[PDB]
């Protein structure tokens with residue numbers, strides 16, 4: 001077999017705190033003699049299905065729960081079977097995030113949602129509204145600061161604005177998603193995205209701002225506002241840029257509605273170390289001890305483990321996180337989510353540049369994201 | 384007739400049985416263009432393992448031209464990526480013979496023989512948002 | 527006066543339907559299904575995969591029943607039976623009564639019914655949802671006589687009727703397929719499919 005027996009190889013995203021995870025691995029090694037290697041490869045969410053398909057890859061893959069339906073569907077993931085006693089230690093709704101066609105296909109780790117993070121020193125009073133940002137920008141665009149910088153290359157970051165006034169991915173009803181009912185080219189969708197483009201046609205954010213550019217900018221005090229997740233808080237602490245975490249700005253009347261991710265740990269179907277990986281995840285990572293260790297590197301957000309969550313919930317930033325979360329929506333985990341995300345990332349990039357109108361950018365993504373009813377009936381499958 | 388969605392035939396041979404007609408004799412309209420199906424198209428519909436579609440309780444089917452036309456449209460919009468057969472076998476840990484692969488052009492489920500040809504000729508399979516597609520023998524060189 | 531079981535398609539509340547592998551028509555194949563014919567060709571005692579597809583999950587306690595009936599109307603009332611020869615050849619797996627034509631292999635939750643009113647045989651297993659990485663549930667059936675078995679099916683074609691039912695035996699779903707149990711399923715499927723295009 002391609003995956004080596006008697007070790008654990010874990011893949012987790014670079015923004016997440018692999019050192020703290022690596023530390024939980026150390027404690028595992030020193031107890032069990034089992035070597036644990038933590039890696040953070042680029043384009044993890046893409047690299048994994050590519051190598052796992054060949055029967056290779058990590059024993060354990062971390063990602064938000066939204067990719068996992070596709071992985072499970074492609075046969076890349078083993079069924080997760082926790083004992084009732086363990087299952088009961090985690091919030092039921094986090095288990096729900098990693099249930100797919102009646103089966104658990106990952107361990108939920110922590111609930112993630114974007115918050116508005118602001119420098120009090122530059123803005124003791126953050127705009128609680130999106131519309132008062134072009135005005136507040138040029139106030140600093142001769143100061144000479146930008147008002148707002150956040151990643152513009154990943155639709156995850158722009159999705160709150162585009163969804164605030166009525167955009168949505170797949171319609172949820174009765175416990176099921178209707179893959180034919182997509183809400184990407186509706187009024188509120190085009191609305192939030194035209195607004196976003198009228199921040200770049202108007203020189204108030206640059207079309208090509210990415211995660212790197214935005215994090216530095218905010219952490220070197222050159223912008224007073226940014227949108228980012230709980231993992232970002234560690235590098236802000238070391239920059240000492242005196243910051244607060246708060247409710248995202250409203251667009252028109254509406255709360256800005258981020259897609260909510262549950263960071264999740266899946267077990268590679270081709271791993272000969274499935275029982276090992278369970279041991280490691282249930283008895284080392286998903287413990288007050290384990291999560292704290294990872295959390296101290298990069299904050300996880302609101303952890304699935306009840307006991308530790310109750311400690312973390314006292315934290316005002318976690319309360320902010322969950323306030324944004326309850327205003328947002330849990331991502332679906334269905335296999336069509338990756339196409340949805342590719343279609344929306346394309347539409348947002350092509351409208352911030354100019355190869356398409358907002359209206360035609362979203363017209364195309366809606367088309368590529370929804371299904372054709374009649375051909376699907378002819379084929380006899382909803383795929 | 385057939386306006387109970389929880390109780391009408393899915394497949395042509397069962398539709399023929401419930402009409403007490405035969406497949407040689409049944410008359411069917413394409414669901415897209417509404418034209419009547421040619422006899423060879425009726426046969427093709429069965430061999431291609433397609434499903435009877437119902438509009439307003441009436442049973443339709445599909446003609447060759449429309450099938451190919453609306454398939455290509457669906458494929459364009461939902462093409463994900465491509466793989467050689469060898470990776471597919473690793474991925475699902477089964478012989479290709481066990482995976483559902485339809486012809487990208489005519490939608491006929493590929494035979495093991497057609498799947499093998501893909502392997503022998505190093506022809507990739509295409510993933511259409513979860514659907515696996517290849518090319519059958521009759522669509523393998525052009526008509 | 528005794529009834530013949532319906533073969534009528536019934537998707538029901540959970541959108542029940544059958545599925546099959548595409549196993550081709552090579553002379554070596556032991557089980558192959560023709561969608562054009564809606565017909566399974568298989569060898570005696572070999573594995574015949576039958577896939578169960580639902581649109582929504584049926585409650586646990588749901589059961590899946592298989593039953594053979596003769597396809598030809600003048601034979602429909604005769605109970606499908608193994609021939610005396612095979613019925614008395616000690617070829618039991620330990621679960622199936624030796625007179626049952628249709629067996630389920632690899633499932634200890636299998637039950638065999640001799641219906642006290644109709645005398646028809648059926649084999650039943652609990653419904654289980656698809657495993658991870660599967661979109662359907664597969665039951666492995668075995669047919670324990672040749673279609674030609676004299677004293678048994680006597681070259682008469684049969685239908686296998688699959689029914690989804692609740693714990694009490696109420697009908698949740700039904701589908702069926704013709705079965706021919708023979709020595710060369712590959713060749714027989716090829717033959718009948720060719721004659722289908724000529725008629």
Ligand SMILES: OC[C@H]1O[C@H](O[C@H]2[C@H](O)[C@@H](O)[C@@H](O)O[C@@H]2CO)[C@H](O)[C@@H](O)[C@@H]1O
Nearest residue numbers: 013015064066067154155156157261341
């Ligand atoms: O931008 C699309 C992308 O969004 C989400 O990815 C998040 C991830 O959930 C976070 O934990 C963090 O790593 O930032 C990512 C965005 O760069 C989805 O989870 C992912 O599938 C999707 O492609």
Ligand SMILES: [Zn+2]
Nearest residue numbers: 413416446449
């Ligand atoms: Zn047509």
Ligand SMILES: [Zn+2]
Nearest residue numbers: 486489519522
């Ligand atoms: Zn073809």
Ligand SMILES: [Zn+2]
Nearest residue numbers: 609612671675
């Ligand atoms: Zn016999």
